[PDB]
Design a protein around this ligand. Structure first.
Ligand SMILES: [Zn+2]
Lengths: 50, 50, 50, 180, 218, 337
């Protein structure tokens, strides 16, 4: 659902608006990560994975 | 295995960043979930049962 | 429908053969509402409801 | 305005009947440039007639950096006069020429994206990689780059004469764009 | 109300846009810090009372990650704001900004260009951390701005004001050795060591011929 | 197709009573009754791999699926014509995809391909130019900058009145179109300062960093655009006020010849200086060269005592000819080994 930067509810395609277009009614998965870039490790938030 | 296919390079080990190539693999989560709900058969691996 | 793209502009003015949608059925029915919209990927939809 | 387009830089090579050794021409010359790992030849830099001398190990040699065609000829055999010092033959037969670049200025701002639509079935450009356009002409078999400032650079010229009738031929195709 | 920077309404969520612009000021600045200072694991065993001289199960193999783990731990931990990793056309490309030249280095350059003709091989080491490419870019630069001093460099073909004899040896004082033949003597040592190797190799070739004939007859 | 009695060419499939016969309207003789319903390996392997590449980037940049399949024939004809050999596999398929994305006239730039690949724009752009002119692509859409305004806003996360920032902007881009600034400049550049100025008068979204994080063009190269259009004509009228309904053309001044304003019967056959008068200048002596002599290039030679002076420095900077020598001593060594 929501991020950590805006942290609002959401803006979402409504369900009856979603069944008239053959779309899926869905919400994105957000993760947070830290990893080894190089000289220094880096922690990056809200990566879209699905 | 998409990481070390790049990390098997002498030059490509300092400035290489990993989140650039995350979105090629993200599409197997969405298309995995939507195909297993429409066509109602779930092809698992851990229990190997259909 | 399946030929390779010729990168030019020579003979493209009349290439459309017909393939309409015919109302079968043994009784006359009315057209209630017909809408047109687009799906998740930009490929247009037509949904008429008798 | 009957202008004349000036010709900035020639190239020309001559074959030589003697094989060149790199030690005996670089370690005891004046404008010594011979890095072995960087490049496999030697360059001379002399300021009259402001030309450059590019050589090869196998014997051949290519001259570049002159203004006029006669100015390259005295340039090309002053370079072999240093080859007269070391005990080498320096046997040239064909003073072959394969490129001369030229520039121009006609000084009136024009559209160039209209001819990418107008004369766009033959010649084209890319805006976000090079700010000028790249124009082509089969009738002399030449390429040329045009601009928005009105200047045109003429390159790829195999013969000196080959672009002189081309430069007047390419001129009227700009004139229909008066950006009315 | 000009088109350059009016503050004019709500402007929500600009605190990360402001501070990442302010943080780039130092990323370019500490490049200026480093330029001015540039100028100037076997196998282990044990003594068990039960089993004496026993070999242990764990150090038989190595992890290859624990020595990498401690290397990572004293690294900087940064929280990424999506405005930092901004890229443009000037990204992932060649080149840098050369330090603008000084009048101190002019008298080290034109005298090197008066004695020699134009020899970029040894000027490159005279300027210790400058490279071969931009001194050639300086050569084409000084043709256009000062077109008369390259003539004076060309015209003067003689010994100059003979002050360069120290500058002759100022180059020649770094690692004083007779390189005309000191390069020869250790190269002689290099082939001398190789001349050992074939003797160590070819005597190892003949020990193969005596053993492989011995079990043939056996 | 042709009847046996009237020899007409038009037939009418009659489905009025579930017979589905085939018959003409001339005579009425059925044409057919009882309808019959329809109830290298290494060269294949080098495109099965190359099909994963095109679906890789198209999943990433949200390229919809009617371009990947359109992109493959451009790869397929370039496969046969010896274009894939030598060059990088991952460097040709993005250049091949951009041909398919240009033909559709879609909002995708060229640098969104390269930034994933972490190479320069000019690396992948150079192998794009050797694709288009080699493989005879004549017709092509132009990089229309009016496409890029409509796609910038949605991930920019501006206000919910996202139409007035667009309706004002394309009318500014139409105003920008007739006016003379973008002709050799960048499509993403001049379209990256209009939506700055269109959102200027309504919001405080202009901080020159959130729009640069969208346009991926440098911060100071769009302020140059804002200094440019202010000083062409009739923009001093539209600095602070003056409701956006002006209808003018004005003068035409692109800044390339404005810098040239700071700097200060046809032709006959034999009127031009030729080349063959210049060939016969110097005698063409192939063995001798002693007719073009001088006095200073005769002195162009070494300082005779100062050879081993410079050679000792030249051998003191030397490490290649050492490295060259033991490789010669090893090629003999590995020959018998
Ligand atoms: Zn019939």
């Amino acid at each position: 659902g929501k991020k950590s930067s805006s942290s609002t509810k959401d803006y979402l395609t409504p369900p009856h608006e979603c069944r008239l277009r053959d779309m899926t009614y869905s919400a994105p998965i957000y993760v947070d990560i830290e990893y080894t870039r190089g000289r220094n490790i880096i922690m990056h938030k809200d990566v879209e994975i699905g | 295995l998409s990481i070390d296919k790049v990390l098997k390079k002498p030059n490509r080990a300092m400035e290489y960043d990993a989140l650039l190539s995350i979105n090629v693999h993200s599409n197997n989560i969405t298309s995995g979930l939507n195909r297993a709900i429409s066509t109602g058969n779930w092809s698992l691996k851990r229990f190997k049962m259909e | 429908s399946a030929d390779a793209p010729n990168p030019n502009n020579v003979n493209v003015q009349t290439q459309y053969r017909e393939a309409p949608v015919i109302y079968r059925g043994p009784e006359p029915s009315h057209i209630d509402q017909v809408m047109m919209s687009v799906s998740d990927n930009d490929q247009a939809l037509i949904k008429v409801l008798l | 305005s009957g202008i004349v387009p000036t010709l900035q830089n020639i190239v020309a090579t001559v074959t030589l009947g003697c094989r060149l050794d790199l030690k005996t021409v670089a370690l005891h010359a004046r404008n010594a440039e011979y890095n072995p790992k960087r490049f496999a030849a030697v360059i001379m830099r002399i300021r009259e007639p402001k030309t450059t001398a590019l050589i090869f190990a196998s014997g051949k040699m290519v001259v570049t950096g002159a203004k006029s065609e006669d100015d390259s000829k005295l340039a090309s055999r002053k370079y072999a006069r240093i080859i007269q010092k070391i005990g080498f033959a320096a046997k040239f037969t064909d003073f072959k020429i394969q490129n001369i670049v030229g520039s121009c200025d006609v000084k009136f701002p024009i559209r160039l994206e209209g001819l990418a639509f107008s004369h766009g079935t033959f010649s084209s450009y890319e805006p976000e990689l090079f700010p000028g356009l790249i124009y082509r002409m089969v009738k002399p078999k030449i390429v040329l780059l045009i601009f928005v400032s009105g200047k045109i650079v003429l390159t790829g010229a195999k013969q000196r004469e080959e672009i002189y009738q081309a430069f007047e031929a390419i001129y009227p195709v700009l004139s229909e764009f008066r950006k009315m | 109300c000009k088109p350059n920077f009016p503050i004019g309404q709500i402007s929500e969520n600009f605190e990360k846009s402001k501070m990442a612009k302010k943080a780039k000021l130092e990323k370019r600045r500490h490049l200026r810090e480093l330029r001015m200072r540039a100028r100037q694991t076997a196998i282990q065993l044990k003594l068990n009372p039960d089993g004496t001289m026993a070999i242990d199960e764990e150090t038989m193999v190595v992890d290859r990650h624990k020595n990498a783990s401690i290397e990572n731990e004293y690294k900087e931990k940064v929280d990424e704001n999506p405005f930092a990793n901004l890229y443009n056309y000037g990204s992932y490309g060649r080149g840098s900004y050369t330090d603008p030249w000084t009048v101190e280095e002019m008298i080290k350059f034109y005298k090197a260009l008066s004695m020699w003709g134009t020899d970029f091989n040894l000027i490159s080491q005279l300027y210790p951390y400058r490279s071969r490419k931009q001194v050639k870019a300086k050569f084409v630069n000084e043709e256009k701005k000062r077109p008369i001093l390259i003539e004076l460099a060309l015209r003067s073909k003689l010994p100059p004001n003979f002050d360069e004899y120290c500058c002759e040896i100022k180059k020649n004082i770094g690692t004083v050795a007779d390189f005309n033949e000191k390069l020869i003597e250790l190269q002689n040592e290099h082939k001398h060591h190789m001349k050992e190797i074939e003797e160590a190799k070819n005597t190892a070739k003949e020990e193969d011929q005596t053993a492989q004939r011995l079990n043939d007859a056996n | 197709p042709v009847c046996k009695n009237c020899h007409g060419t038009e037939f009418e499939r009659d489905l009025s009573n579930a017979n589905n016969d085939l018959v003409c309207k001339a005579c009425g003789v059925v044409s057919e009754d009882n309808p019959i319903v329809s109830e290298l390996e290494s060269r294949e392997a080098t495109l099965n791999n190359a099909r994963r590449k095109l679906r890789a980037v198209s999943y990433a940049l949200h390229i919809p699926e009617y371009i990947t399949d359109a992109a493959f024939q451009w790869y397929k004809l370039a496969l046969a014509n010896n274009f894939v050999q030598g060059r990088r596999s991952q460097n040709v398929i993005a250049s091949c995809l951009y041909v398919a994305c240009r033909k559709e006239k879609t909002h995708h730039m060229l640098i969104d391909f390269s930034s994933r690949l972490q190479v320069s724009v000019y690396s992948i752009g150079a192998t794009f130019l050797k694709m288009v002119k080699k493989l005879h692509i004549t017709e092509l859409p132009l990089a229309d900058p009016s496409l890029f305004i409509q796609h910038f806003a949605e991930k920019l996360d501006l206000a919910d009145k996202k139409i007035k920032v667009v309706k004002d902007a394309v009318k500014l881009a139409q105003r920008m179109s007739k006016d003379w600034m973008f002709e050799g400049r960048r499509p993403a550049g001049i379209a990256g300062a209009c939506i700055l100025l269109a959102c200027r008068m309504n919001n405080l979204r202009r901080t020159h960093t959130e729009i640069v994080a969208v346009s991926h063009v440098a911060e100071e190269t769009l302020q140059q655009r804002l200094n440019e259009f202010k000083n062409t004509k009739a923009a001093k009228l539209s600095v602070q006020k003056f409701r956006e309904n002006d209808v003018e053309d004005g003068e035409a001044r692109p800044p390339s010849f404005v810098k040239n304003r700071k700097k200060e019967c046809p032709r006959n056959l034999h009127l031009l200086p030729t080349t063959d008068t210049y060939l016969s200048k110097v005698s063409d002596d192939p063995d001798n060269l002693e007719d073009v002599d001088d006095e200073e290039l005769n002195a162009h030679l070494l300082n005779e005592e100062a050879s081993k002076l410079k050679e000792r420095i030249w051998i003191g900077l030397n490490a290649d000819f050492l490295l060259e020598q033991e490789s010669k001593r090893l090629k003999q060594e590995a020959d018998i080994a």
